[PDB]
Design a protein around this ligand. Structure first.
Ligand SMILES: [Zn+2]
Ligand SMILES: [Zn+2]
Lengths: 148, 56, 183, 56, 98, 31, 119, 92, 147, 96
RNA sequence: GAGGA
């Protein structure tokens, strides 16, 4: 058989239910009171700070204008919040860390004794980890123990 | 080749060209044969350079 | 993009088979030498062993794999806390140096932002998992040639690189003249 | 010639059949690896030998 | 070859967004020992999460590609036996029609 | 590839480490 | 074998001897948690492994297009519908035996006619 | 309309292409001896069918008549030579 | 072969055995460290039956127990007799060594040192698997008779 | 006074399709049913809810006004859920 | 660049 160019003619020829208002909190109480998140890790499931101990304090451990590497302030500001915060007594401790994972879509529902729920935009989120639970760390001594 | 199931060891699945050059090769066989042939070309190209250096 | 920065993290498994003490040392950019991994894991905040193995051997029956791991655990048993780990890396600044390296040079293509150590930890664990899987002979070594693992730089990306470089240079010089206008 | 052709064909067919039988046996784990080589290698060699004998 | 073309690359974000919208438990909450059947979900080789019932997910993704919603030059593998589901909007890949 | 470049990549090369201690870079125009 | 973790420290519970009643004692060498053993066994090497052959049998494998299909009748179930594949051991000296997966009762069974196998 | 689909090397790993539309999947059902020995359909769960196999060839190879009857090195030689042939390269 | 013996395939098998380098690792199946402080009663009730013999007609509490394949033990034509000889003579200084008998359906070999054990013992087992040439000579891997 | 205030407020958390979340970082009315919830908007679309994790353990909420500063620990995570989508009209808007 | 052989 052969290649046929007559096919142009071929086609051419062929052709309980609760309900609550979800009020917006005052800007002002927020304006100082940033909200964040608590996450411990020990798997001592309960981790009640009330039953942790007491007292429980919480605190964070040339010429004219020349060349500057630019960045949005917040990250710069985030960069400049690098004192992680702890719970102690004056013995058990916990140290938090910045999650930076889902600040985007997390709205805290003000589950108060009242049924009204205020939708609190979670501001940050921190992961808390114990420490000095055996105070056994030889930061310079240990480096000696490595080579042996 | 994606045209096959997995773990087929039948001769044509692993490259047993069967038709003659007269009958022409089915597209698999054609490809397989192309692989073999290129191996041939490469070997020839390398072998001449080797033997040249050896002889020198 | 973004002044495309190619950092090639590698993981090395030490010692041939049977050669006792097969330990895994990772390689980081701008680091004296390889690092036992468990150091890195703690440096990312996964402190306990059990959590680390959870980050690596996803099934708790793979005692095969766990046995493979145990030497690295024992290797790292010296260090036991994050900041010590960061100390290992090379002041009063050494710690901060380590931390910033991780936030900018460890796995750039995950993020260079602040808090994702959970991510890079998990991902590293996975990488190790695959390396182990190979060295246990359950996958074959990677095929260097599988065409899926290749890319072709057409005129677009070639000019992209070229022009990015040129323009970076142009900015540098414009800034320099700005300075020379101190007068 | 025609007759020669289909004779060739059935020769090839016999080859395929022998390969298949070897395969079935191997997958029944009944294949006995000749000493000094892997079971898998033994099977693979057998197949290659059959196929070359067939071609010739 | 004659019909092969070459991907030009696509912003991945909307895909990730959609994934989160359809499951894909984010990474930070992944607890292997209790979620043993999760399919790791990658994108341009960036492990972004895990997910259960990957089958329906893959189905949906395929369908979406098959009506232009996801740019059709996007590849989407689902290795059943490795519980992985890679995706690539990467530029430079080579592909052919079918 | 070339169209893609000259339409997006060109711009996003600029809208990058552009501003200089200040000088800004905006819309890019091609004749 | 298994590993053990200091249910408080959560770390490698190394073994140790009682030294008087002389039974095993796993001790967290990060902490003070100590326990005996459930077994006298401590470690096992397994230089030739029959495991990893049929790996990744997910309850999805039937959906794989590329996998072949046989007719061989399920022993447990009695379907004639099955996906089969070689061992995933991926070692050079690996048998050729096939592992059939019934598509109804998802019951693995092997092509082998030497004996019975379970990966 | 989703009748055709773009496939790259990675995804190729997990599909099951059929070579020829019809014969590869009509059903399970005298042969011209001169015709080559096509294998079978032999499988059911295809997911894609090749558009036309002759498209694996590149440009230069597509010039060759019946390249499926030639010994591959010959094909390669022709592919190389075809770029020497005299001929009209441009109409202007 | 020497002319004897020119064509005695049997002789050839003898020699092939005699020269092929055969290591312990190649014959065993899996190695396990147990804690049995009992001198004379294996925690396992299977090696215990062996302890009814092979025990008698200053120790360590850590048994190292070994499993070999009968098929390989016979293709290599080996007897737990000889292997016991091998390991014994390789030390005789530290290890009471006990093996299942070549009759026994399973190839079971037990050893105990005479501390900080359970780690040195690991080194010992590695050395046993690797650095022990049961028969034959180094660097000789596969010997294949031919006509 | 370095310490908490109550440290017990048991609160709820949800994850919202971000097309709706950004609207809420600057009221509403909700069908809070049994283990079956849909969400009526303070209006366009209609949305559903799931209970991701009833046991909301280890984890609580705090707030803030060797550097210390004042802190007020709100209290616990009472529980948490996640938002899903008029889901057809939403899905029609969702695919974009 | 090219490239024949
Ligand atoms: Zn402990
Ligand atoms: Zn069945």
């Amino acid at each position: 058989f052969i290649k046929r160019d007559r096919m142009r003619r071929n086609f051419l020829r062929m052709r309980e239910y609760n309900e609550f208002p979800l009020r917006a909190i005052p800007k002002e109480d927020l304006e100082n009171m940033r909200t964040h998140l608590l996450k411990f890790q020990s798997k001592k499931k309960i981790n009640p700070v009330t039953d942790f101990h007491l007292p429980v304090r919480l605190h964070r451990k040339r010429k004219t204008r020349q060349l500057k590497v630019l960045d949005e302030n917040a990250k710069k500001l985030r960069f400049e919040e690098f004192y992680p915060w702890v719970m102690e007594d004056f013995y058990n401790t916990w140290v938090g860390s910045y999650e930076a994972g889902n600040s985007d879509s997390y709205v805290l529902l003000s589950v108060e004794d009242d049924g009204s729920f205020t939708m609190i935009p979670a501001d940050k989120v921190y992961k808390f980890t114990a420490r000095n639970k055996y105070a056994t760390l030889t930061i310079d001594e240990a480096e000696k123990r490595m080579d042996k | 080749l994606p045209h096959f199931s997995k773990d087929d060891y039948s001769p044509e699945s692993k490259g047993f060209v069967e038709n003659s050059y007269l009958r022409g090769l089915t597209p698999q066989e054609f490809f397989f044969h192309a692989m073999g042939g290129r191996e041939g070309l490469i070997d020839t190209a390398v072998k001449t350079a080797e033997t040249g250096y050896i002889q020198r | 993009k973004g002044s495309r920065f190619i950092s090639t993290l590698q993981v090395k498994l030490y010692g041939r088979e049977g050669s006792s003490a097969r330990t895994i040392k990772a390689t980081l950019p701008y680091i004296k030498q390889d690092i036992p991994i468990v150091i890195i894991f703690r440096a990312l905040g996964i402190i306990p062993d059990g959590e680390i193995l959870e980050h690596i051997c996803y099934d708790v029956n793979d005692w095969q794999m766990l046995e493979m791991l145990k030497p690295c655990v024992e290797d790292g048993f010296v260090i036991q806390d994050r900041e010590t780990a960061l100390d290992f890396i090379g002041k009063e600044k050494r710690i901060q140096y380590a931390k910033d390296i991780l936030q900018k040079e460890f796995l750039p293509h995950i993020t260079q932002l602040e808090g994702f150590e959970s991510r890079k930890a998990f991902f590293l664990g996975y990488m190790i998992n695959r390396l182990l899987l190979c060295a246990l002979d359950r996958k074959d070594q990677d095929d260097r040639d599988h065409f899926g693992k290749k890319r072709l730089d057409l005129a677009g990306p070639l000019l992209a690189q070229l022009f990015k470089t040129l323009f970076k240079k142009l900015t540098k010089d414009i800034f320099r003249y700005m300075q020379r206008t101190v007068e | 010639d025609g007759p020669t052709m289909r004779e060739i064909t059935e020769t090839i067919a016999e080859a395929k059949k022998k390969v298949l039988d070897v395969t079935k046996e191997a997958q029944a784990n009944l294949l006995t690896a000749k000493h000094g080589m892997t079971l898998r290698e033994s099977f693979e060699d057998n197949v290659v030998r059959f196929l070359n004998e067939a071609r010739d | 070859s004659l019909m092969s073309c070459i991907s030009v690359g696509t912003d991945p974000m909307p895909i990730i967004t959609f994934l989160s919208e359809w499951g894909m438990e984010p990474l930070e909450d992944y607890v292997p020992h209790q979620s043993p059947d999760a399919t790791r979900v990658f994108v341009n080789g960036v492990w972004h999460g895990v997910h259960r019932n990957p089958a329906r997910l893959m189905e949906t993704l395929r369908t979406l590609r098959r009506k232009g919603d996801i740019n059709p030059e996007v590849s989407m593998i689902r290795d059943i036996r490795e519980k992985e589901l890679k995706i690539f909007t990467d530029a430079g890949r080579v592909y052919r029609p079918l | 590839s070339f169209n893609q470049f000259v339409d997006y990549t060109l711009q996003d090369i600029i809208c990058e480490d552009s501003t200089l201690i200040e000088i800004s870079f905006g819309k890019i125009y091609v004749t | 074998t298994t590993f053990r973790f200091c249910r408080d420290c959560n770390n490698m519970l190394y073994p140790r001897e009682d030294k008087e009643n002389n039974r095993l004692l796993f001790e967290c060498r990060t902490c003070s948690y100590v326990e005996e053993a459930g077994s006298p066994l401590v470690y096992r090497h397994e230089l030739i492994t029959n495991i990893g052959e049929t790996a990744g049998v997910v309850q999805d494998i039937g959906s794989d297009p590329t996998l072949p299909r046989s007719d061989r009748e399920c022993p447990k179930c009695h379907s004639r519908e099955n996906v089969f594949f070689q061992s995933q051991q991926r070692r050079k000296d690996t048998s050729m035996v096939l592992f059939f997966v019934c598509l109804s009762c998802s019951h693995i069974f092997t092509s082998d006619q030497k004996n019975k196998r379970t990966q | 309309e989703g009748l055709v689909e773009y496939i790259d090397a990675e995804e190729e790993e997990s599909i099951l292409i059929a070579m020829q539309p019809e014969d590869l999947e009509p059903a399970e059902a005298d042969v011209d001896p001169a015709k080559r020995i096509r294998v079978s359909h032999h499988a059911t769960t295809f997911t894609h069918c090749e558009i036309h196999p002759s498209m694996i060839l590149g440009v230069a190879a597509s010039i060759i008549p019946f390249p499926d009857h030639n010994q591959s090195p010959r094909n390669t030689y022709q592919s190389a030579m075809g770029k020497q042939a005299m001929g009209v390269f441009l109409t202007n | 072969l020497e002319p004897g013996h020119a064509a005695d395939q049997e002789q050839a098998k003898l020699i092939r055995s005699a020269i092929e380098h055969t290591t312990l690792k190649s014959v065993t199946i899996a190695s396990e460290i147990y804690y049995d402080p009992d001198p004379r009663s294996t925690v396992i009730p299977e090696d215990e039956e062996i302890i009814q013999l092979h025990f008698s007609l200053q120790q360590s509490p850590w048994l190292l127990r070994l499993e070999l394949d009968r098929a390989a033990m016979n293709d290599k034509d080996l007897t737990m007799g000889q292997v016991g000889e091998r390991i014994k003579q390789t030390f005789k200084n530290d290890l009471f060594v006990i093996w299942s008998e070549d009759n026994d359906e399973k190839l079971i070999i037990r050893c105990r040192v005479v501390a900080e054990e359970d780690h040195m013992l690991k080194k010992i087992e590695n050395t046993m698997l690797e650095n022990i040439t049961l028969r034959g000579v180094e660097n000789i891997e596969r010997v294949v008779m031919m006509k | 006074d370095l310490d908490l205030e109550r440290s017990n407020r048991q609160v709820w958390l949800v994850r919202l399709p971000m097309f709706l979340a950004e609207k809420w970082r600057d009221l509403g009315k909700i069908r809070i049913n049994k283990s079956k919830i849909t969400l009526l908007l303070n209006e366009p679309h209609e949305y559903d809810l799931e209970l991701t994790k009833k046991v909301v353990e280890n984890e609580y909420v705090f707030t803030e006004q060797t550097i210390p500063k004042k802190t007020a620990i709100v209290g616990t995570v009472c529980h948490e859920c996640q938002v899903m989508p008029y889901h057809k009209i939403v899905e029609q808007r969702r695919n974009i």
